[PDB]
Design a protein around this ligand. Structure first.
Ligand SMILES: */C=C/C(=O)Nc1cccc(-n2c(=O)cc(C)c3cnc(Nc4ccc(N5CCN(C)CC5)cc4OC)nc32)c1
Length: 305
């Protein structure tokens, strides 16, 4: 029924990479900004290293390992890549560094400077990665603006696959109704989450259903209520979100369709999003935690035979 998964999982020596700074902390683990030099080859790769702070807990490791298994098995420009695993006292995940951080943080921080062309483009990129997930048959089960990371302001990537699962087999606000009521997840259910994600970007990081109980949420959706149209949004952009939130999953648009629609819009962005001073805005040595190296290469340019 299924093809063999012939992805390579790479084991790395601790000496190979160094941790420079702490990006985030808490719960099971903390993730570090880092530099990785691979073996014999003389290149330096910027990495995000995530490791379990609380030593080893036998229950805990399954989640970290599963994340690695899924990450290794994916190759796409708009999906985040796992370089290696380090089997120390604590399992360590070495991943490509997304220098500009969380997409959700980014829109909130830069809302004054984010143009329509960037927004439509981000929408296209997320759909492309998500469609790739669909080709895989993997389901994100947790797609949100928070789970998209930006490598350059013009290039974002889907992330947080730890909960990811194969088709067949909490972020209640992002969840589809079929997921809330019946714990059912499908690529189409994923599409609904994509719509909430699009809404977050359009609203520049606003919180959906703010001040609403999750307990409340199923009824509201059952009621047929949905998220409001964003001020920047034209009816054409808003309608796409609405289709994503339709109760009948098959009725909802496919990611492959979503890529098509957003691109057409991206072709003439001002028509579909109206934002004050759209024309004016601009969005971004240059390496941190090291002075020495100009041998740096992005993970993306670093390929493995
Ligand atoms: C979206 C919320 C969020 O903070 N997510 C987050 C926090 C910390 C680390 C990561 N994170 C990963 O979990 C996994 C990978 C692969 C990853 C890759 N690259 C980054 N880059 C990155 C994230 C966050 C930050 N900051 C620093 C400044 N601080 C105020 C905000 C968060 C910086 C950064 O690279 C500079 N993060 C990753 C995700």
């Amino acid at each position: 029924g299924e093809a063999p998964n012939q992805a390579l999982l790479r084991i790395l020596k601790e000496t190979e990479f160094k941790k420079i700074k702490v990006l985030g902390s808490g719960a099971f683990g903390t993730v570090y900004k880092g530099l990785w030099i691979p073996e014999g080859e003389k290149v330096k790769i910027p990495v995000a290293i995530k490791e379990l702070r609380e030593a080893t807990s036998p229950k805990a490791n399954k989640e970290i390992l599963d994340e690695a298994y899924v990450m290794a098995s994916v190759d796409n420009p708009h999906v985040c890549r796992l370089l290696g695993i380090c089997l120390t006292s604590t399992v360590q995940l070495i991943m490509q560094l997304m220098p500009f951080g969380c997409l959700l943080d980014y829109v909130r921080e830069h809302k004054d400077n984010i143009g329509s062309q960037y927004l439509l483009n981000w929408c296209v990129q997320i759909a492309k990665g998500m469609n790739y997930l669909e080709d895989r048959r993997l389901v994100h089960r947790d797609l949100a603006a928070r789970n998209v990371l930006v490598k350059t302001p013009q290039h974002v990537k889907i992330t947080d696959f730890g909960l990811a699962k194969l088709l067949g087999a909490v972020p209640i606000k992002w969840m589809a109704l079929e997921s809330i009521l019946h714990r059912i997840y499908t690529h189409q259910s994923d599409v609904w989450s994509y719509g909430v994600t699009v809404w977050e970007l359009m609203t520049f990081g606003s919180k959906p259903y703010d001040g609403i109980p999750a307990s409340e949420i199923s009824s509201i959706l059952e009621k047929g209520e949905r998220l409001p149209q964003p001020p920047i949004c034209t009816i054409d952009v808003y309608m796409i979100m609405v289709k994503c939130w339709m109760i009948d999953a098959d009725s909802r648009p496919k990611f492959r369709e979503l890529i098509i629609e957003f691109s057409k819009m991206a072709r003439d962005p001002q028509r579909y999003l109206v934002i004050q001073g759209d024309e004016r805005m601009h969005l971004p040595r240059a390496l941190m935690d090291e002075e020495d190296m100009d041998d740096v290469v992005d993970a993306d340019e670093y390929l493995i035979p």
